[PDB]
Amino acid sequence: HGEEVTPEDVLSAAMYPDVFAHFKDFTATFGPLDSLNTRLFLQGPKIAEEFEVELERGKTLHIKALAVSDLNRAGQRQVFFELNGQLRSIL
Amino acid sequence: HGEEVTPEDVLSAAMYPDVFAHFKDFTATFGPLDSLNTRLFLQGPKIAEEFEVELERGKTLHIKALAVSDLNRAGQRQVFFELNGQLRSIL
Amino acid sequence: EYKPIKKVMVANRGEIAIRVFRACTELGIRTVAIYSEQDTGQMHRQKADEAYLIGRGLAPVQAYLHIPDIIKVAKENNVDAVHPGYGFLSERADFAQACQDAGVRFIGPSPEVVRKMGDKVEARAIAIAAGVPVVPGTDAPITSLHEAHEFSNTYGFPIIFKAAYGGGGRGMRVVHSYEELEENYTRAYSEALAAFGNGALFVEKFIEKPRHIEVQILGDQYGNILHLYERDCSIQRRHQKVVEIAPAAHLDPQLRTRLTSDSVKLAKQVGYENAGTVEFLVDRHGKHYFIEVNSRLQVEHTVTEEITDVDLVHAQIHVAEGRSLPDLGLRQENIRINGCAIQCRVTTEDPARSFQPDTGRIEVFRSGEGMGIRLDNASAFQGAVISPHYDSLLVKVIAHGKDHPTAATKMSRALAEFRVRG
Amino acid sequence: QENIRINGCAIQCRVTTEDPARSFQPDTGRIEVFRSGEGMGIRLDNASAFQGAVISPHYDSLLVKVIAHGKDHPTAATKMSRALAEFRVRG
Ligand SMILES: CC(C)(COP(=O)(O)OP(=O)(O)OC[C@H]1O[C@@H](n2cnc3c(N)ncnc32)[C@H](O)[C@@H]1OP(=O)(O)O)[C@@H](O)C(=O)NCCC(=O)NCCS
Numbered sequence A, B: 001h002g003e004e005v006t007p008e009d010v011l012s013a014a015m016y017p018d019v020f021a022h023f024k025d026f027t028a029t030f031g032p033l034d035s036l037n038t039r040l041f042l043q044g045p046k047i048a049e050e051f052e053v054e055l056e057r058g059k060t061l062h063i064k065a066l067a068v069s070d071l072n073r074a075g076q077r078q079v080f081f082e083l084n085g086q087l088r089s090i091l
Numbered sequence C: 001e002y003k004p005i006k007k008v009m010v011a012n013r014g015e016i017a018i019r020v021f022r023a024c025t026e027l028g029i030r031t032v033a034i035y036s037e038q039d040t041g042q043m044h045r046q047k048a049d050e051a052y053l054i055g056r057g058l059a060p061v062q063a064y065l066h067i068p069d070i071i072k073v074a075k076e077n078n079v080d081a082v083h084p085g086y087g088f089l090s091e092r093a094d095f096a097q098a099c100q101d102a103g104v105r106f107i108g109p110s111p112e113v114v115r116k117m118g119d120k121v122e123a124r125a126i127a128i129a130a131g132v133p134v135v136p137g138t139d140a141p142i143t144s145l146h147e148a149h150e151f152s153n154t155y156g157f158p159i160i161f162k163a164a165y166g167g168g169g170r171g172m173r174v175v176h177s178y179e180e181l182e183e184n185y186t187r188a189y190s191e192a193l194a195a196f197g198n199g200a201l202f203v204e205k206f207i208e209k210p211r212h213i214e215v216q217i218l219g220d221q222y223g224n225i226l227h228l229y230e231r232d233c234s235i236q237r238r239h240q241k242v243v244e245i246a247p248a249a250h251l252d253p254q255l256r257t258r259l260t261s262d263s264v265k266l267a268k269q270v271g272y273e274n275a276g277t278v279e280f281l282v283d284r285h286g287k288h289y290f291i292e293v294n295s296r297l298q299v300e301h302t303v304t305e306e307i308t309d310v311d312l313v314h315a316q317i318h319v320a321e322g323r324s325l326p327d328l329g330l331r332q333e334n335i336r337i338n339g340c341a342i343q344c345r346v347t348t349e350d351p352a353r354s355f356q357p358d359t360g361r362i363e364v365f366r367s368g369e370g371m372g373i374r375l376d377n378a379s380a381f382q383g384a385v386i387s388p389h390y391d392s393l394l395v396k397v398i399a400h401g402k403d404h405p406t407a408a409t410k411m412s413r414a415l416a417e418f419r420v421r422g
Numbered sequence D: 001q002e003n004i005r006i007n008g009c010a011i012q013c014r015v016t017t018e019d020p021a022r023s024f025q026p027d028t029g030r031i032e033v034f035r036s037g038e039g040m041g042i043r044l045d046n047a048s049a050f051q052g053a054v055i056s057p058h059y060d061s062l063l064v065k066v067i068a069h070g071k072d073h074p075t076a077a078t079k080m081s082r083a084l085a086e087f088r089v090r091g
């Protein structure tokens, strides 16, 4: 998987292949973790409150939670979020 | 309050000025009617169903009830409906 | 030829930030944005590589006016140049000096030229120095009723009181009598001394039928100055611009070339060196009366940008780098007119009561894009909240066509296609 | 014939829900976030692109018709590249 080059991950897989593969899959799926607030990462946003998450020295995001719908057709709820100025809806 | 007067309107004002005033203010405030079925007019639509409203034979517009938020501030709720091909939110 | 720029920061908010970010991204330059605590939900920070908070414990409008915080932000992020936009520290000579003292280039004219501009006395003295005739009026500020009476008696009866401490309307009242003249002078003087600072007023004739022309001025660091073309924005609600027409509506060609040459000469004499604006004023018989000089880039530059098809921000950045105009391939014999354009500013002002601003939440938003429609979405999107602290501009819509009526009809269609509810 | 002249250069691209990796196999689903990339010399012809849109598996798969105009071919290419980078169509 991937075309990333470093010895550290090779060593880590040498100690543990399975956990390394699972962690790599999780990171490739959900992108950059460990940029969240601890409470945000543990419980998630509270309803209709604006929180802030930073990603880099200049990359900072403010996200607002709008609403959550119910099972539409195949148990796939539609949750509504707000961007810094925009709004989001996710299946 | 008048914008459409015709001699029959003068006649109605001659019989029932009060309920005519109430009628016109209520309807001009809340848009036109007579385009909705009884389910729509007396009970209204439900979440997770698409229904149809006929305004005039030239046009017919689709409505789908996505979800409704909870009251937050200033007593100004926001609800999410979709007109045919877009998504709408109303104060 | 000289040191290139690797990173640029902007000191404004709204549409200018977006425009400058697009221009920089076209040239592969990193972008840095600033924002205030209240201005946290806008769309102008998602279009930048990095965005930083400023004015944490300040007023919502005065957060963007704190020089030391901006300088400190610039120092820690290895910023090479800063863009002043328009109306946010752009016309403050001290800010340019502070930027220069920190080793950061300032995108615009030198602080000396900015200080020379601004106050009207030096501008009038420079204009009267060579050609460029100005409106009849007093040179020094007027603070006395009696001297106002002699200047009323000499030139003519209808006069307008023009204030200082703000280029805005202020006490823009006209005198047609004497009984009302004394009381209006007293009221205006009291308002100037109380609500404002200096009670500097001027006695000058009110042109009965004004019609003012703008010219875009572009110059380099090597003493080469290029004018773009003229404009007309005579449509004014009370004293603010409403609608702009890219080419001149009906101007004599001799008047066109005379006004262009006068603008170029005035730019040369001061030795101006960046995107700059020269305003004018025309009477019915034909009298070009100089008004003022804007040292920044104007908000109605887009219409000029499309007739010439020359990108102004690109040229501004290139001339900030040090490259001369001939290297860029820009000559006054190389540009030409192509069609007509119209610009309209969409605001949240109730057009019935008093043009009073309105605030609320946008529930429905839609856009219309066609053959000759260019759109500049500042802060208009689904579920947006408009604040009462800043300007009330939603979208800047520009329409281009081969003729004036065609462009007008296209703009009417585009406006009809828009839908703003709530 | 005499009144028609050349002025500038233009480039055309079509955004399609095809997977360029495997076989350009068309993909179906629901659009979760959409954003526009209008600019200086950018013309946009939005066929059907909006929040919560659904792509039909049986009709054509055109999302947005994007047109970039410039004074020269490299300039148009650069403008089109920046305009495509501004577009964000996740999910
Ligand atoms: C960063 C980039 C190289 C790659 O973007 P990407 O692969 O699609 O996704 P990334 O997570 O890596 O970064 C972009 C995302 O972070 C957001 N964000 C980007 N820059 C930001 C900044 N200074 N501050 C706060 N948020 C920012 C963007 O809105 C985008 O969100 P979205 O596409 O999901 O709606 C490029 O797409 C980008 O966004 N550059 C900054 C904006 C830009 O390039 N504008 C071009 C014209 S100015």
Ligand SMILES: Nc1ncnc2c1ncn2[C@@H]1O[C@H](COP(=O)(O)OP(=O)(O)OP(=O)(O)O)[C@@H](O)[C@H]1O
Residues within 6 Å of the ligand: C135, C166, C167, C168, C169, C172, C204, C205, C206, C207, C210, C236, C238, C239, C240, C292
């Ligand atoms: N002699 C005059 N005759 C008629 N109208 C005048 C005259 N002088 C000024 N005005 C009007 O009053 C305005 C005065 O401009 P002023 O410099 O006071 O405003 P400002 O805040 O700089 O605004 P802006 O630069 O955006 O026009 C002019 O734009 C014009 O509309």
